């Protein structure tokens, strides 16, 4: 346009997005786990009440 | 004089413009510009209406224009031309100001800023017409433009939200024109109207905006319902894409109304009950909403009579709806007391009133339901009663005539009896006491499924406002 | 630089650039998904923080 | 060629219509291209419209008269948008009023009552007082009597319905049968037994030997001049238990209680 | 493993249903008691809506919490009765 | 993560928390969010190891979220 | 205008009227889509039949109808069952929906077939059509300018030969600073996205030869490829090039860097091999 090599950096955005959404799969890892952690603490709640 | 008044409308708008504008060029924040846009419309109606009618043309000169000033002049020209204090240096508030685009920066080269401002401007046109109460030529002209404008460009998340209201105005004006007066043209534009919205729903699926999709479905559904095409509406709703994600409670009220109504004539009354009972409560309860609310109340009772159940006499009495709920009360009473002669006089007498609210086609079907109530009473009151006595009571023609009524009725389980042909009577089979039966378990399980639904429904929604509110900064 | 007199990109990269949100359609459908995941992973964190 | 179909109907040779119709079908595409199928209407198009329409209407009656219900269904569908678009100035015919009467009978005779009410809603605003109900009374009144459950008033309208012939006898004869099956289903619930004589009067026959034959085929044994309605009912029911989907739909005790505990425990 | 084990019918003690007199007792008590803590729950939320949370809880019986205690009883009697229904439905069908 | 919560021995829990930092040497940005949970909990051995996990991982130049959890 | 004739016309008997039903159906189907979704078997019947030559057109109708439905998956089989008259819609950016869906599919198949044998597009194991669409989808990126949009598509499709043909389109010295960067970005991606052992090793080593070919390059990029794979063979060859570009400052800068970066195993093997070859005792 007025500043060229606007078709190398357009594709760097794309490249970065495929990385980042894998690191929000690291929050979907965590999501199963916070279900199995509260599950465990509900168990140890039983054991403390006992 | 005039100039003073124009500067004030422009100034008032600038504020409104800023609010939605600052957010959307940060990055889209979809929900928040939507809530502001609702408030914005209300303040703009008063602004436009008073302090002359040439303010819209002015507001245009203040922002950037490629062809925006030109388009707006033609609209104004129609309602008698305006261009006084509407040209740069007297409708120009910029002159090195950065919110309204720096003047140096505007002259100097390329990159557009036309997008959001163009879209916003269109909304103002719609509202401008609607306040005037002139549709005709101006509407047709405006209609043609804005449709190829939205599709020239490819919409943003925010830009979707503005057309979700824009379409509502194009839809509605055309419905009023079509219902004014019948022409060859009236038939032509109906075709165009359906085509554009239905394609635009395809696009809007992929852009991820629920609010555009939700409005479109309502409009499209209203269209089948008007023109009596049951057949077109049944396909639309079975090839679902309705969102429950991001809507208003306005939108759920419209949707649930159209669904109930459509289902009624096609002989399903049970799910329609769910839909219309649902619609009333979701709708905002107010005195400016009285039109939509009044239409729902009329439908709901009519739908109760179709089942063979009876809505309250208490209902028609304590309302402040009494004037309009004048026909329904007699329609219910006629069915409740099961006299067929009363029912015939009623539907004749209120024929004009009902036709408007278009429950008239349903009133014809209720004549079945009359008979049903009238034989229900007889069976309950006398357990064992000869068909002879039923003829005396309800003025049936013969023994046979009533025999056939019952015979058909008990297949559907309405009267819940069995006929004794040889002894000449009807012997009723209801006797209760199902605390010996295993019946309570199914009943109870349906109640426990409602209670389980309420359990899922709280759990998801509760934390959700909390998580956003914790994320945002606080002391 | 800004205007609308002069069309962006000197009108040669608006239809050879509209084959590009389809490359990116896969990631933005999935981005939408992610926004409900974020809400959920603190949702159940609150329950276990109280617990 | 095109014009031959039009004069062939007037002859009264209605199979001659159908054997002539294939060339006219290729030539009917040419007719469709002249109109834009009414997305604009003009006065050039108004002459042409009469041509396109005339071919469909005479095929439509001709098909009913050779008892080709299928072919009729397709015709009606083509025709319907042509009356539907535009302010009237050639949007009706002498033939139309009769045509809608015939389609409404076809739905009733197949017992698709669901589509009978939908279709009437859409139909309403073309026949309200503009063609009015003048012939349309015949499937409409029949309908009023079937909803009420007066199988008696319903039978009489059919019986008097044979004096006036337009061509409705191809669907009256089918509707005579439709009634019997409806009555036959309802009387199973009512009683276990009706003497042979009481069966004839209810289920509408003119021979006592037909009444007995119908019963045998329908799976009621007449033994000692008493029908046993219960037979078929037991056999239908036995069949549902024979096929298996079956354990979950009814739901076991064990299954209800397992569902509670797992809802909680997520 | 030697410590963890128990009897030869401890691993075969869910088929051992209870006498139903005792189960009726369990049904009757839980419903009655909850009426009285519910009454207690009504009094608590009539006020408690001015400022300072602890004060309000000291004033209108928000300590000695009935809100917590009503939930607890309900849940407790709720998990029991799912298994009792489960037990009966198994033993009736399984044996005969 | 599984070893840490579900193992009923305190010593076992610790060794698992500390380990995380070795794996996540490459990307140390997300680690204070994994352990936010583990610092909330009040077991001596788990907390003692939450502290270390973060130390190994977020070395080099500081991380504002890491600093905050440790406080 | 209304879908009711178009329904009636397929059911009408004569070959010409059946061909006519197709042509009407496809022109207006974003008004009229709902009704012909129900009457789909007649459309599948015509596809089957080799007694029409508008068989292609009938598979084409089926792809539009499915798109409007929301059932995009079957759309691709039927869009590709028509073959031609798909180009019409490949340059249309309102129905590039099925054009794009085919590619998303390709990625999924490729990750399976990459363990069977490295080449699986060049052997036929997968549909020829799915392969043809991919390589024209790449063509569009190269109309728009630059190889980078395409590089990213192919990495995901486990097409190794495509990556090579693209990188050589930028070796000819257009401008060396850009040419190194265009490699630099692709390395940083390959380490973090593909974690599959074979594919990741290929991209680094393939990159190493391209980088060598220009005599002017960052040697910072070259050192990263060596260190990540920790091979002595890359390390030796790196010094053979530096042996024909030898001078005291340049050749020491990379050796001093290399020891810092690389592991103790690379260094131990590397010194012996340079001595057996012949080198200065100062470098060593």
UniProtKB/Swiss-Prot annotation, chain A:
Domain of life: Eukaryota
Record note on modification: N-acetylated by NAT3.
Entry's localization field: Cytoplasm; Nucleus
Summary of the function given for this chain in its UniProt record: The 26S proteasome is involved in the ATP-dependent degradation of ubiquitinated proteins. The regulatory (or ATPase) complex confers ATP dependency and substrate specificity to the 26S complex.
Similarity comment: family membership: Belongs to the AAA ATPase family.
Protein name: 26S proteasome regulatory subunit 6B homolog
Annotated source species: Saccharomyces cerevisiae (strain ATCC 204508 / S288c) (Baker's yeast)
Swiss-Prot record, chain B:
Residue ranges of domain PCI in the record: 253-433
Gene that specifies this protein: RPN3
Biased composition (Basic and acidic residues): 463-475
UniProt lineage: Eukaryota, Fungi, Dikarya, Ascomycota, Saccharomycotina
Cellular component aspect of the GO annotation: proteasome complex; proteasome regulatory particle, lid subcomplex
Record keywords, A-Z: Acetylation, Phosphoprotein, Proteasome
Similarity comment: family membership: Belongs to the proteasome subunit S3 family.
GO molecular function: enzyme regulator activity
Positions in coiled-coil regions: none
Protein name as catalogued: 26S proteasome regulatory subunit RPN3
Further remark: Present with 16700 molecules/cell in log phase SD medium.
InterPro entries per record: 26S_Psome_reg_C, CSN3, PCI_dom, WH_DNA-bd_sf
GO terms under biological process: proteasome-mediated ubiquitin-dependent protein catabolic process; regulation of protein catabolic process; ubiquitin-dependent protein catabolic process
Classification via PROSITE patterns: PCI
Cell inner membrane is among the record's keywords: no
Function comment: Acts as a regulatory subunit of the 26S proteasome which is involved in the ATP-dependent degradation of ubiquitinated proteins.
Binding partners and assembly: The 26S proteasome is composed of a core protease, known as the 20S proteasome, capped at one or both ends by the 19S regulatory complex (RC). The RC is composed of at least 18 different subunits in two subcomplexes, the base and the lid, which form the portions proximal and distal to the 20S proteolytic core, respectively.
Post-translational modification: N-acetylated by NAT1.
Swiss-Prot record, chain C:
Organism taxonomic ancestry: Eukaryota, Fungi, Dikarya, Ascomycota, Saccharomycotina
Function, as annotated: The 26S proteasome is involved in the ATP-dependent degradation of ubiquitinated proteins. The regulatory (or ATPase) complex confers ATP dependency and substrate specificity to the 26S complex.
The name this protein goes by in its record: 26S proteasome regulatory subunit 8 homolog
PTM section of the record: N-acetylated by NAT1.
Subcellular localization(s) per the UniProt record: Cytoplasm; Nucleus
Subunit comment: May form a homodimer or a heterodimer with a related family member. Interacts with OLA1, TMA17, and UBR1.
N-acetylthreonine, modified sites: 2
Gene name for this UniProt entry: RPT6
Anything else known: Present with 4700 molecules/cell in log phase SD medium.
Family from the record: Belongs to the AAA ATPase family.
Domain of life, source organism: Eukaryota
Annotated source species: Saccharomyces cerevisiae (strain ATCC 204508 / S288c)
UniProtKB/Swiss-Prot annotation, chain F:
Superkingdom of the source species: Eukaryota
Note: Present with 4750 molecules/cell in log phase SD medium.
PC repeat spans: 15-47, 49-71
Post-translational note: N-acetylated by NAT1.
Function: Acts as a regulatory subunit of the 26S proteasome which is involved in the ATP-dependent degradation of ubiquitinated proteins.
Assembly notes: Interacts with UBR1.
Native organism: Saccharomyces cerevisiae (strain ATCC 204508 / S288c)
Name used for this protein in its record: 26S proteasome regulatory subunit RPN2
Signal peptide: none
Record family assignment: Belongs to the proteasome subunit S1 family.
């Amino acid at each position: 346009n007025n500043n060229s090599a606007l078709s190398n950096v357009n594709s760097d955005i794309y490249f970065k997005l495929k990385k980042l959404e894998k690191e929000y799969e690291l929050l979907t890892l965590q999501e199963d786990y916070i279900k199995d952690e509260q599950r465990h603490l509900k168990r140890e709640l039983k054991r403390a009440q006992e | 004089l005039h100039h003073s008044e124009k500067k004030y409308a422009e100034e008032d708008q600038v504020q409104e413009l800023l609010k939605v504008l600052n957010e959307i060029s940060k990055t889209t924040l979809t929900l928040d510009p939507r809530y502001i846009w609702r408030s914005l419309k209300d303040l703009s109606s008063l602004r436009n209406q008073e302090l002359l009618n040439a303010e819209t043309l002015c507001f245009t000169v203040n922002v950037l224009y490629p062809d925006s000033s030109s388009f707006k002049k033609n609209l104004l020209k129609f309602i008698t031309s305006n261009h006084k204090s509407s040209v740069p240096g007297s409708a120009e508030l910029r002159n090195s100001y950065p919110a309204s685009f720096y003047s140096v920066n505007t002259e100097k080269k390329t990159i557009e800023v036309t997008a959001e401002i163009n879209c916003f401007m269109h909304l103002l046109v719609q509202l401008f017409l609607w306040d005037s109460k002139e549709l005709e030529q101006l509407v047709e002209f405006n209609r043609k433009v804005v449709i190829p404008n939205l599709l020239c460009y490819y919409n943003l998340r925010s830009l979707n939200l503005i057309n979700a209201k824009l379409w509502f105005y194009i839809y509605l004006s055309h419905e009023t024109l079509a219902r004014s007066s019948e022409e060859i043209n009236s038939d032509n534009q109906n075709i165009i109207l359906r085509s554009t919205m239905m394609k635009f729903l395809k696009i809007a699926s992929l852009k991820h905006d629920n609010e555009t999709k939700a409005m479109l479905i309502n409009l499209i559904l209203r269209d089948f319902l008007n023109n009596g095409e049951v057949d077109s509406a049944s396909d639309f709703i079975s090839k679902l894409e309705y969102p429950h994600t991001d809507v208003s409670s306005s939108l759920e009220a419209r949707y649930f109304f159209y669904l109930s109504k459509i289902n009624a004539i096609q002989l399903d009354y049970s799910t329609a009950n769910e839909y219309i009972i649902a619609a009333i409560r979701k709708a905002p309860h107010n005195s400016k909403s009285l039109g939509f609310l009044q239409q729902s109340n009329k439908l709901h009772c009519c739908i109760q009579l179709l089942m063979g159940d009876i809505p309250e006499l208490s209902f028609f009495h304590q309302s402040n709806m009494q004037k309009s709920l004048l026909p329904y009360y007699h329609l219910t009473k006629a069915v409740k007391l099961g006299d067929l002669k009363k029912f015939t006089s009623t539907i004749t007498k209120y024929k004009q009133l009902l036709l408007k609210d278009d429950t008239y086609q349903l009133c014809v079907r209720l004549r079945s339901n009359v008979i049903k109530t009238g034989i229900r009473i007889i069976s309950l009151t006398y357990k064992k009663i000869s068909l002879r006595d039923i003829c005396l009571k309800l003025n049936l023609d013969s023994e046979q005539t009533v025999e056939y009524m019952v015979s058909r009725a008990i297949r559907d389980g309405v009267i819940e009896a069995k006929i004794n042909h040889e002894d000449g009577f009807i012997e009723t089979t209801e006797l209760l006491n199902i605390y010996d039966s295993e019946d309570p378990q199914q009943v109870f399980d349906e109640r426990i499924k409602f209670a389980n639904q309420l359990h899922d429904e709280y759990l998801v929604s509760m934390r959700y406002p909390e998580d956003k509110k914790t994320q945002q900064n606080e002391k | 630089m800004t205007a609308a007199v002069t069309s962006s990109n000197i009108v040669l990269e608006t239809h050879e650039s509209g084959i590009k949100p389809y490359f990116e359609q896969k990631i933005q459908e999935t981005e939408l998904k992610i926004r409900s995941k974020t809400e959920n992973v603190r949702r159940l964190e609150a329950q276990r923080n109280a617990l | 060629l095109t014009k031959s179909l039009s004069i062939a109907f007037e002859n009264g040779d209605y199979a001659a219509c159908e054997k002539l119709l294939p060339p006219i079908k290729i030539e009917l595409i040419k007719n469709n291209l002249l109109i834009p199928d009414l997305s604009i209407q003009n006065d050039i198009y108004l002459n042409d419209l009469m041509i396109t329409k005339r071919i469909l209407e005479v095929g439509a009656l001709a098909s009913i008269q050779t008892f080709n219900f299928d072919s009729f269904e397709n015709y009606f569908n083509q025709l319907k948008p042509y009356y539907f678009s535009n302010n009237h100035k050639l949007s009706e015919s002498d033939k139309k009023s009769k045509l809608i009467s015939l389609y409404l009978l076809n739905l009733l005779s197949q017992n698709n009552t669901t589509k009978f009410h939908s279709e009437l809603q859409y139909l309403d605003k073309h026949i309200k007082n503009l063609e009015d109900d003048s012939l349309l009374s015949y499937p409409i009144k029949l309908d009023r009597w079937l909803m009420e459950g007066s199988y008696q008033k319903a039978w009489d309208l059919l019986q008097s319905g044979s004096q006036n012939i337009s061509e409705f006898d191809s669907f009256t004869d089918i509707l005579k049968s439709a009634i019997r099956d409806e009555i036959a289903k309802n009387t199973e619930l009512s009683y276990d037994f009706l003497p042979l004589s009481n069966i004839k009067a209810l289920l509408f026959f003119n021979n006592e030997k037909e009444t007995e034959k119908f019963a045998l085929e329908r799976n009621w044994p007449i033994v000692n001049s008493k029908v046993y309605f219960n037979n078929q009912s037991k056999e239908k029911a036995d069949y549902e238990d024979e096929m298996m989907h079956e354990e979950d739909q009814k739901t076991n005790i064990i299954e209800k209680a397992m569902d509670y505990a797992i809802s909680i425990e997520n | 493993k030697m410590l963890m084990n128990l009897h030869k019918e401890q691993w075969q003690s869910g088929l051992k249903m209870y006498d139903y007199e005792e189960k009726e007792e369990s049904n009757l008590a839980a419903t009655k008691s909850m009426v009285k803590i519910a009454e207690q729950y009504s009094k608590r939320i009539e006020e408690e809506k001015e400022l300072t949370e602890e004060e309000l809880k000291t004033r209108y019986v928000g300590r000695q919490d009935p809100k917590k205690h009503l939930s607890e009883t309900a849940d407790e009697t709720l998990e029991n009765n799912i298994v009792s229904v489960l037990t009966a439905g198994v033993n009736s069908v399984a044996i005969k | 993560l599984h070893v840490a919560v579900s193992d009923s021995n305190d010593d076992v829990r610790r060794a698992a928390v500390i380990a995380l930092g070795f794996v996540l040497l490459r990307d140390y940005t997300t680690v204070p969010r994994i352990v936010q949970l583990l610092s909330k909990s009040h077991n001596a051995h788990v907390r003692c190891g939450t502290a270390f996990a973060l130390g190994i991982a977020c070395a080099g130049k500081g991380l504002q979220s890491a600093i905050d959890v440790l406080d | 205008t209304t879908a009711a004739p178009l329904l009636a016309l397929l059911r009408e008997n004569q070959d010409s009227v059946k061909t006519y039903a197709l042509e009407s159906i496809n022109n207006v189907v974003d008004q009229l889509w709902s009704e012909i979704s129900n009457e789909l078997p007649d459309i599948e019947a015509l596809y089957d039949d080799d007694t029409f030559s508008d068989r292609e057109m009938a598979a084409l109708i089926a792809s539009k109808v499915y798109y409007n439905l929301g059932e995009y998956e079957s759309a691709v089989k039927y869009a590709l069952a028509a073959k031609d008259r798909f180009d019409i819609d490949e340059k249309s950016q309102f129905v590039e929906t099925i054009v794009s869906k085919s590619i998303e599919m390709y990625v999924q198949e490729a990750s399976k077939q990459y363990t069977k044998d490295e080449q699986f597009y060049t052997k036929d194991i997968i549909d020829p059509k799915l392969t043809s669409i991919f390589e024209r989808m790449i063509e569009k990126c190269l109309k728009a300018s630059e190889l980078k949009l395409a590089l990213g598509i192919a990495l995901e499709g486990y097409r190794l030969d495509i990556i090579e043909s693209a990188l050589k389109s930028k070796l000819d010295q257009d401008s060396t600073s850009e040419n190194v960067k265009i490699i630099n970005y692709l390395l940083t991606l390959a380490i973090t996205t593909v974690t599959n052992s074979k594919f990741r090793s290929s991209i680094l080593r393939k990159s190493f030869d391209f980088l060598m070919n220009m005599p002017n390059c960052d040697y910072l990029t070259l050192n990263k490829v060596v260190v990540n794979l920790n091979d002595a063979g890359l390390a030796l060859q790196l010094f053979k090039k530096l042996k024909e570009e030898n001078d005291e400052g340049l050749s020491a800068q990379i050796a001093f860097d290399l020891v810092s970066s690389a592991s103790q195993q690379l260094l131990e093997i590397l010194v012996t091999e340079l001595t057996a070859q012949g080198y200065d005792p100062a470098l060593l």
